[model samples]
Target: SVGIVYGDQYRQLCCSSPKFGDRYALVMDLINAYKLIPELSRVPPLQWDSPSRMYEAVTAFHSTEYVDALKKLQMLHCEEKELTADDELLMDSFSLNYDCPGFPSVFDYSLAAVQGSLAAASALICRHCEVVINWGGGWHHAKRSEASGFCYLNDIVLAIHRLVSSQTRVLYVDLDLHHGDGVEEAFWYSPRVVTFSVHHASPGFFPGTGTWNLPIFLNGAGRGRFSAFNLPLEEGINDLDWSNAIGPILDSLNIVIQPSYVVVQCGADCLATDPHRIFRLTNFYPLSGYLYAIKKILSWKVPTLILGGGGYNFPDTARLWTRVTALTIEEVKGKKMTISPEIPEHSYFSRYGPDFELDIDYFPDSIQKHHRRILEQLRNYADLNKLIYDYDQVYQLY
Candidate 1:
């Protein structure tokens, strides 16, 4: 059975307000849709899932102190009726809460998410499954000891640690509009894990990092040539062009790393018409294409683990992820399926309303007119071979 893990607390965390809850509700519905498919197995609650089981089958890579802190913070929040403006501000303040008495339960919720991630990895290994999908575990920006970007426990890092211990080299791909900075930072000194992130690079973006101009570290064993790859792009990229940019990179990864395990983060915020962010994408099209490409690569027989990331638009994120779920199922069954119709009320559609679904038709005259120039620019400058060679040489020894 295909392994899937999701939790209601993911929705509760968003209970701080309706906007956050709306996003949570949409993701939850997508999870429900995936559950409707016969081949999938939804994991049980996190509390019943054991740490020992996770450690035995997976690496359990996480900071103990951080986990403890998350537990405390969650408990504190459970007692409060509603989150105040101060609570929102506090959640953003990663530094003050490490052990601060004022808000201990934030740490609790963080740890709960981490534990859920560990359980998802354990299920993959124990079940001998080729693909495992976790709906609640892509807290990519959380650091070893600190939290950033609404993430507190860095579950992806912990999952990687588990995979590495089992002698599986991992390739982590992040498609979130923002850089996978925390994950990149954690594995920056390691060779066993290669991180490839495609994100927005405009100046003044949040956390203000992931610039193409920044020099990668090459100090320790594999120093100057480590395997962290970042491709920061300008806004307004569409489906066909976005796929073109990513396709070659997947090719280069297979040629170089030959990783036994793959982890993909499908963040929906990158959808061209996201209401909260400015980057332009054909909503789910680029993401679905990427999932298809990865599945094709794995046909060479590699184990893969995938997770959801930073999509904020309710309906679009749900639709995109549901498509991924369907695609994964189709690959396992040896059949290809057609894409579904886009949902109109999805926040993304609402923003671009009358013209939203029009983007799905690849041959549309208007989309082609607007996006062709940017696509050409991307194709000319993106060099897959150089990226792979440089990445390999830099992190060969870590």
Candidate 2:
């Protein structure tokens, strides 16, 4: 079965400002209007208003000062007051302006997403579901004491923390357009959680730290050597490029890591239609790049938690996630769902302008060339099988 963390309150909270502005709301609306998933035991709603549990869970990963500052910021929003100089300093110190702003529900919004992912994790942990979806989670760029790349919290990290145990190994696969730096850093020194991220790592990119060498360097010093795999690509990569580049790596990891649990961050910003113009990943046709990657991950057939991340194009983002939700249902039910490509009539039907269909094709003008050297470099550096063999010799006792 599949469990989704959703509720009216949760949706409203996730739609809070500094996000993509009601993007969450629209995603939920589309999913609901379509009646995509079986809503019986699938939707896990956030009911309580208490902050203690949320505070405790978040503080496990975030610093005390940072969490408190978020609380303070939320309070100021409640008071409806102007920013004092100290307030300005506090916001700046936490990188809580600009990309990640200090909004009214800063604390609540962050905590809400965390709670959703945690709920999904709980469902997996308790064996209540084989797959769980938390569309509001996967804020991958958040740090221990600061925010980055519009991610004010690292719910992906927190959820993985909950899903892992002594006997459990987790494979954290990040399909976001950007590198999942925060999640990677959290589990950097541990072999228990292996993070594999593929993103656009071109020069001057936002949060540009996921070079192929960064993980190699981190692996050099840590107990988690080779546990972190990164594939950084240049712009104009289309669906086929992604399948060629990332598909084989995922297949290899399934054998090497042998994860008991898997967490996938499905950020739709990599869509060719996104305003960012980064990667030309498409959700349409035989070269459905995002679905290809997602299907491969889902084929692992482990207890999986899927979360949402960076997607700016609102309508397409909704389309991507909705399709993902449907695919997850298909995976769990062992049946192929026949969903119509046409956008169903809903409150946000107008947003699916022009064609009003659920297809995002690859950009024809996209420059496609050989990324072979870069792919080879990634394969060499990752060296997953070798790492596992060496790690077993050192840590495993017969």
Candidate 3:
């Protein structure tokens, strides 16, 4: 049977700093996983002090120069008593926390992240696990030689490289708020990998890529039937609209690509309650539904791997990820799992304000209204499915 692999380091990173808002949600996710499935075992922790294995894995996808630059910047900022906006932005953009600020050590911690990913992928390959979920990785913005979008090292690419040598076609599905720019860039030229990203796009969003209509730029591998599919949506979209946009894409992919392996990144920033993000989605709405639906569609019938990406709200992110963990376990065991309201009522919602409550019953009315609008838009667009199908006929496959 397929099982889970995670470690305490992810939690340690959360509780140790002010940025716990982001990392804490991930911690909550794992904690809730235990509540969801009693049989799942935590993976043995890797020593962060020694991250050579991670470095090797990350280097397989990233360039040496970019890695060295990240180390230098991390060291210069470590001695600061307080991080400035620039410092925070740089770190956040690279997805590196303050604990990973030391020069050589920053590289080490980033490498540690990569190591955690490698460990997860190795488990999937060796154990022949149906699904392996890694919450500590998904550094999607790190470019071939530069870091952007809070990603210093592209763990997804690194893990894919480790597995690609087996000659299995890999499908990468990203549902982050921002585009999976770095991952797409890494494999943009390679036909062996298929990338599909659905993200928010406006004039000023970070990494200002992933436009709505762009030609699929394929490298010399000769495969050319839109291997890269990107759907850039406007802000304030809700779950139903999200499903509408993604469902047809997945249907087309399944019919055409027929991939051997799948990797999905479910970034939570797209959810509505995250103050740090602009998209509209209630905390419990997106991730849980997406995971449950995907699992239902794939049905333990294929080798699938999932990872967490960009959710920023601590309590909500935690709750959503917990749902994902539970649903995933249920999918593997062929059992039906129900929702549990055992979340810490006070601690989870306290960040919102004194008036806010963490319980699932208190979702905002405004968010609900927004979801209604999203549903209307989705139904309106559903009629275009046939046209898109006809358009696909003229494209050539690699």
Candidate 4:
């Protein structure tokens, strides 16, 4: 079975975040607009009477002082209290005054993501579901003490931490346009977790860290040269470029690690219609990069947690995730689920516009010929077969 962790409150809290207002609502509205709810096993969200319960779990991955600062900011925002010089310094020290600012009940927004992903993790751990979806989760850029990009909390980290408590090995694959720096950094030295991230890795890309090089891994603490694998692509990549690389690399990783559980951060910012314009992944199945990677991962039949990450174009992000939901249900039921090409009539129907279909406008795979060079660079930078041999010797199953 497949479970989805989402609710009205999750949407409301996620929508209240800075630079992403109403984006969460837009995604949920389209999912409902497409009428895909009936096919999914909607997991009940966590509802603790006291916020401390959630904070305690968050502190498992985040720093204690950082979580406390978030709590203080939440109360300060509620009371409309002015920040003293010390408070300003404290907020700056924790990075709450910058990209991840202090909003009303900001900790609530962060914890909402944590609770949803935690619920998804529990659903998987309890064997109530083989696959779970948490669109409100996947804030992968937040570190233990600082928030980067728009992610105030590293929900992806918290979820994987929960999964590892019950399992021996967990594989984390990040498909966000930006690197999964926070999660990778957390488990960079842990042998039990293997991190794979595919992102735009040019010099000017946001966060700018994933590289297809294994030499650096030798200096790091984890599985020698195979601990963390990254495929950093250049600009103007197409769906074919994405899936071709992602599919084979994931296949190799599956065989090498024999992971008991999988967590994929399917951020939509890499899509063609996104305002970022980093990659040209179409939203159409069979040809979409995101769809192909997810379908390939789900085919592994491992208990998996799928989480959302980044996307700017609101309506298209909605379309992409809604399509993913449909694809997931289709995979679970072993029956073809019909997703209408025509946009359904709903509150956000007009936003689809121009073509007014579920597909996003994108350049053809043939348009970009430079991706081959990027793949060749990846080949020159790392050897998968060599890494597999190294992993076998270094990673013990005991």
Which segments of candidate 4 are over 4 A away from where they belong? Answer: 49-52, 212-219, 222-225, 365-398
Tens digit per residue, CA lDDT, model 2, 1-398: 77888887887888886657888877877787678755425656443457676677788799878988888888888886798999889989999788777777788888888878888888888888888888888899999999888777788888899888525789989998898989988888777788888888877787878773523434322656556777777888888878777776677666656789999999999998888988888777446677887788888888898899988999889888888877877777877767788888888899888888887534551212223333343344346434333333322211
**Candidate 3 per-residue lDDT over residues 1-398, each given as its tens digit:** 45454556654542343333356544454455445546354543244444575455456777655565577565765665665778566655544554333343455445555766666667667765667767666778877776665556777887777666664777788878888988887777766677877788778777788763244323122342235556677776666666655665565565445567777887878767676556665545233336534654466266666777777666566656666677676777777666545444433444444444333233334333433433332232223222133323312211
For each candidate in the order shown, give its overall lDDT on alpha carbons.
0.59, 0.78, 0.59, 0.79
lDDT of 3 at 325: 70
Output the better candidate (1/2) by TM-score.
2
Q: What's the TM for model 3?
A: 0.75
Error of 1 at 1 (Å): 3.9
Looking at model 1, residue 121 earns an lDDT score of 68
Candidate 4 vs. true structure, TM-score: 0.89
Per-residue lDDT of 52 in model 2: 77
Tens-place lDDT digits, model 4, residues 252-298: 56766678899999999998878888688888874888889889998
What lDDT score goes with residue 267 in model 4? Answer: 92
Worst 10 residues of 4 by lDDT: 389-398
- Model 1, span 97-142: residue lDDT tens: 4333334345544455566666666776675466777766677887
Off by over 4 Å in 3: 13-22, 25-34, 45-55, 78-105, 212-225, 283-289, 344-398
